[PDB]
Amino acid sequence: MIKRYLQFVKPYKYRIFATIIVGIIKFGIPMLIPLLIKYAIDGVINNHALTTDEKVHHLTIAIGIALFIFVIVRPPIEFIRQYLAQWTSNKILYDIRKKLYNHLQALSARFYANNQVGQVISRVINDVEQTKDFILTGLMNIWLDCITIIIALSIMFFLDVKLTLAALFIFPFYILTVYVFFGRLRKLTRERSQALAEVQGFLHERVQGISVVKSFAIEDNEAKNFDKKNTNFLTRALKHTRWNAYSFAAINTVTDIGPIIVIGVGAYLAISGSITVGTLAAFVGYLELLFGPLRRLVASFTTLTQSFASMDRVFQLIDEDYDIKNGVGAQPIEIKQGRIDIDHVSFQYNDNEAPILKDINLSIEKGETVAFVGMSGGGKSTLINLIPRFYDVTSGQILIDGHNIKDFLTGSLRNQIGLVQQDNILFSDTVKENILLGRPTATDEEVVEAAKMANAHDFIMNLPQGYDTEVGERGVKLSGGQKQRLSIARIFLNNPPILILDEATSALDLESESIIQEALDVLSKDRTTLIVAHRLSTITHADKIVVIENGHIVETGTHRELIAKQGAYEHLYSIQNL
Amino acid sequence: MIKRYLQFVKPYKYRIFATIIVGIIKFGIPMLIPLLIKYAIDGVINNHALTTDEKVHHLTIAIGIALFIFVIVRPPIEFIRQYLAQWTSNKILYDIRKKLYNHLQALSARFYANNQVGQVISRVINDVEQTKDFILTGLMNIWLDCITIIIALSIMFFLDVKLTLAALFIFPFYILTVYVFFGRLRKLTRERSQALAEVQGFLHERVQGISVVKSFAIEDNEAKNFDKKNTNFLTRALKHTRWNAYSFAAINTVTDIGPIIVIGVGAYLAISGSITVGTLAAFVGYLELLFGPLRRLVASFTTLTQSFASMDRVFQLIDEDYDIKNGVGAQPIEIKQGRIDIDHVSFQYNDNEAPILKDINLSIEKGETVAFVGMSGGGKSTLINLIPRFYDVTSGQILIDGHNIKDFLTGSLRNQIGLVQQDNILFSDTVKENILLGRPTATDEEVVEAAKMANAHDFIMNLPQGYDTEVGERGVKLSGGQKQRLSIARIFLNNPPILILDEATSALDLESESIIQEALDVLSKDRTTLIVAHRLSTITHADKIVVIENGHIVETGTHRELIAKQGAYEHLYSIQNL
Numbered sequence A, B: 001m002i003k004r005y006l007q008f009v010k011p012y013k014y015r016i017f018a019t020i021i022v023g024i025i026k027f028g029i030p031m032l033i034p035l036l037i038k039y040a041i042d043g044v045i046n047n048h049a050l051t052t053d054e055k056v057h058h059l060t061i062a063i064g065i066a067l068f069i070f071v072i073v074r075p076p077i078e079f080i081r082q083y084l085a086q087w088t089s090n091k092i093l094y095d096i097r098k099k100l101y102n103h104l105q106a107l108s109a110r111f112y113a114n115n116q117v118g119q120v121i122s123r124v125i126n127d128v129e130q131t132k133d134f135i136l137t138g139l140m141n142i143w144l145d146c147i148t149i150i151i152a153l154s155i156m157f158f159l160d161v162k163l164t165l166a167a168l169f170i171f172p173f174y175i176l177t178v179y180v181f182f183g184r185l186r187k188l189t190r191e192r193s194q195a196l197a198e199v200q201g202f203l204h205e206r207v208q209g210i211s212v213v214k215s216f217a218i219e220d221n222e223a224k225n226f227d228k229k230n231t232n233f234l235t236r237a238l239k240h241t242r243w244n245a246y247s248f249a250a251i252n253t254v255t256d257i258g259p260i261i262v263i264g265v266g267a268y269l270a271i272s273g274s275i276t277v278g279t280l281a282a283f284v285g286y287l288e289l290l291f292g293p294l295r296r297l298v299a300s301f302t303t304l305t306q307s308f309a310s311m312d313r314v315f316q317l318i319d320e321d322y323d324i325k326n327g328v329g330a331q332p333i334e335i336k337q338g339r340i341d342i343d344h345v346s347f348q349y350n351d352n353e354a355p356i357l358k359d360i361n362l363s364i365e366k367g368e369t370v371a372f373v374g375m376s377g378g379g380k381s382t383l384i385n386l387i388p389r390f391y392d393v394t395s396g397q398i399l400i401d402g403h404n405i406k407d408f409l410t411g412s413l414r415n416q417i418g419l420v421q422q423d424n425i426l427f428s429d430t431v432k433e434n435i436l437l438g439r440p441t442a443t444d445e446e447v448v449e450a451a452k453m454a455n456a457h458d459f460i461m462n463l464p465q466g467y468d469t470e471v472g473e474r475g476v477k478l479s480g481g482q483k484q485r486l487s488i489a490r491i492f493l494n495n496p497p498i499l500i501l502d503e504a505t506s507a508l509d510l511e512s513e514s515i516i517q518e519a520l521d522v523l524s525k526d527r528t529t530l531i532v533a534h535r536l537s538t539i540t541h542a543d544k545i546v547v548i549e550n551g552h553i554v555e556t557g558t559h560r561e562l563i564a565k566q567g568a569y570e571h572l573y574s575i576q577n578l
């Protein structure tokens, strides 16, 4: 997995090597201080053979050299060292989210139907952000502490063989201890982040649906439901904390026996006649070089563990399967004549549940306007959404111009089906911006046309700041008949070969309906049109009305014919002016 | 402002003092190492009064002791020190969000109409989380570095009053430099977080409205709109980084002239007779005690700056005004007879724009069923939402049972108005759980009743896992007529004195409508009922139909009467069969 994450760092290897290099060229600085203390003390006074005008000169080039270094050389090193480190990782994260976002937009209706936005976003943002330390503490700092440990161990290896061995005794345990905790922390961190992710999802879901929370003044009740999630997140976060604290003491206690099992031995050796009591003095002086980094790595360890947990979660999302895949046979196909064929189609949202659409057979020739009518929850919506291929039929096939939907390139297919869903969306943008969704690359002139078409242009002008009026988030600042008509506009703008209208009238008064009806009757003159509808009267003109019951097509025909049959269709119609 | 944030820490003062105490009792440990060293060397090896059996002996008591301390005393100190620190702040954050959530649920439709969920949540979560360092690095660590600076400084002053002035010379500049940057960083951090907040809002808004992004295969276009926001966030984050790096080098360069200017003067003073080498050398071993903490504080500084920026943003949200306030006169009032009076009401969403409802006068007696009909965007929705007081009328008054709506306690008022909005909400929960929103404290039996009432009970049983079926996020796994009927259920469950139904039929077929119509005609027998509707026929039975045009009430009357007048009402009705 590290290899994966590394794939992100790849185009930044050099900036990172550089960051490490400049990193090493830093220890050289702290050592210049104690080096300078020795120069004035033993090179101007303890020389005893210098003038009181000569030594008061060398102290003006030594107090001249130091200043130069520290006031000119160090500053740039310090700066670059940091700026680099950051500039690097920060750009890396950028890259990761650029990818995640494309990933999301490529998941299927299903995914988003069984997932919580808040939770998803937690990952894309927080978990990713968390992998930052892996780049910094992991690939840019840990090394310097190991280099320091090599140097130290090395120097010690010369001063004395067995004495350094007195040290290394600790090492194995240290490593064992790390290994013991690592895993459990990784999980605790995982479980923690997940908790956070759940409060996010909660907030998201509620903050957006407050309308309801307000209407029934259930603030107190929901405020509880929140505390549950907010608490769960504490709890988990504490478990995590407890262990980090725990493991920290552990690893260190081990790292601390280090200098002891050394000093103790270093004496029982200098006195037992094994080595110079000067060697013991020097050696023990380097103890800070060995068990210093080991102490830092304990913290570096911790941080990483958490980081791993995070990249886990990131990748886990990245590894989500796309339910609607293009497949090798991909083929941007132009739909020249709206010929739709539904052969033996059968649909199921899941393998466990029952099928919603069972055996559906229906043929729609170019230019026909087919209407779909039936009790609520019959299948209409489901059936329809199978065409733009939002879900893949379970058993059977749908063919546009003889081509099986699956053999189209997603975008191609979808781009040629103007679809007005029943639950229509608006972004917290301007009117224009919203219509432009139907065709982003459109003339401010063409938009105003679509508008006038969907019977929108007019009310758009009365809006403060007209076509540039910013509608509310979710498009709240408009009526029902308004939001809807903007969705309809999008259709004219798209001006596709196939038009599917799932109750595209829902919120319009009788009049406005009349207008859009006319408008549509025109645009729907020579295009393959599918209409789901409950208000029958706006379907009479249909070339063929399809009655759908309990996932089946029960009746088929012209309003005239269906009415004669005095069957299912008639029943429903008959309920209007009766 | 610090005082504010501190108010959160208050109930944790002791745990914090404790964390600081145990914090101090830590430096005592690192010093035990060099003491065991000096004690071994200058104490047992060179005592010149030790039997080879005594020095070894006294050596051992020094080790047996060391192990005890480090393997028994230190561990607990280490643990507690951390666990405390964390347990504290983590609980503090918890508290802060507990408050923020209540804050949100108390903001008005307006707030949420001009704000972006994602952005809000960024604050509640990220910005708050960011204030964590203020507790840790601020109130628990900074001190220890100052204590260390006092201790250090004291020793210098008794060692030479005029050389400590060679050291302290730096101090003022150090402080000046900090002051110079602080502010700019605080902003950069602010601006950065805001950027993050904007990508959040983007993600939220899109990830939830992908349905549309998919339908028009505008993935490429939106993926761009994302990169803009994702980039903006980089940029800003880099600006921030650059400065931190910058300021870091700065402050340190200053902190580095420190040990030098002590040597620059101190050495010159040894010469002229200030004092000798025995002092210049001793006043230099402690240099690490002074310019060590000063170096750490540079980092502590940085971290804080960021923290402040964060609490700024948190508070800024906390300081948001509630548009609908209760006011001293608050009074949980029981509405015994649904008497609604709309006297000269006039509404405007903003002071700049034009009024939507102008001069409306209408009286509704208990048990009357008033219908509201008119072109789309006329005012109906707006008018209606004024009653549950979702927005305060601009000029005029609405009175229920003679009591002015404003004199009710929000919850009281709203709890007594069963409101079925046109754009109905569902949470990613189970069917039951959703209906329970109408009355959380309800009998699994009463729910099933509401259900059967809204004509839902039936389809709920055919659902895999019946009343326990988990509907999709936003309630996606149900038809239109389905989601809606669940909203209607909520009403029966609430069983309020006043019922407002804003197109509560929108997505139902003719039949299902018939059923709920009957169901309602019953529940609406003796209650004050207000109905907004476009499908006229389901309004005929109204006691009084109100025609609303361009924010005005144009016609008033019984379907019978209105039809005779051959005016505005008739026109609209007349378009049904025509």
Ligand SMILES: Nc1ncnc2c1ncn2[C@@H]1O[C@H](COP(=O)(O)OP(=O)(O)NP(=O)(O)O)[C@@H](O)[C@H]1O
Binding pocket: A472, A476, A477, A478, A479, A480, A481, A482, A507, A508, A509, B110, B113, B349, B350, B356, B375, B376, B377, B378, B379, B380, B381, B382, B383, B422, B503, B532
């Ligand atoms: N949050 C808002 N800010 C500004 N204007 C708003 C806001 N919310 C709604 N509006 C106004 O909504 C207005 C009229 O709404 P309105 O006529 O009450 O909806 P309606 O006719 O009942 N909806 P419908 O029954 O679907 O046709 C427009 O002229 C908008 O400016």
Ligand SMILES: Nc1ncnc2c1ncn2[C@@H]1O[C@H](COP(=O)(O)OP(=O)(O)NP(=O)(O)O)[C@@H](O)[C@H]1O
Binding pocket: A113, A349, A350, A356, A375, A376, A377, A378, A379, A380, A381, A382, A383, A422, A503, A532, B472, B476, B477, B478, B479, B480, B481, B482, B507, B508, B509
């Ligand atoms: N994500 C899902 N998982 C399982 N079932 C689903 C899901 N989404 C929708 N359904 C099914 O929705 C079904 C029938 O939907 P359907 O009849 O197409 O809506 P419809 O009749 O067109 N809506 P409407 O025009 O408002 O009456 C139910 O029996 C559900 O089980």
Ligand code: NA
Binding pocket: A367, A368, A369, A524, A525, A526, A527, A528, A529
């Ligand atoms: Na047609």
Ligand code: NA
Binding pocket: B367, B368, B369, B524, B525, B526, B527, B528, B529
């Ligand atoms: Na009534």
Ligand code: NA
Binding pocket: A479, A480, B380, B381, B422, B502, B503, B532
């Ligand atoms: Na409305």
Ligand code: NA
Binding pocket: A381, A422, A502, A503, A532, B479, B480, B481
């Ligand atoms: Na539907």
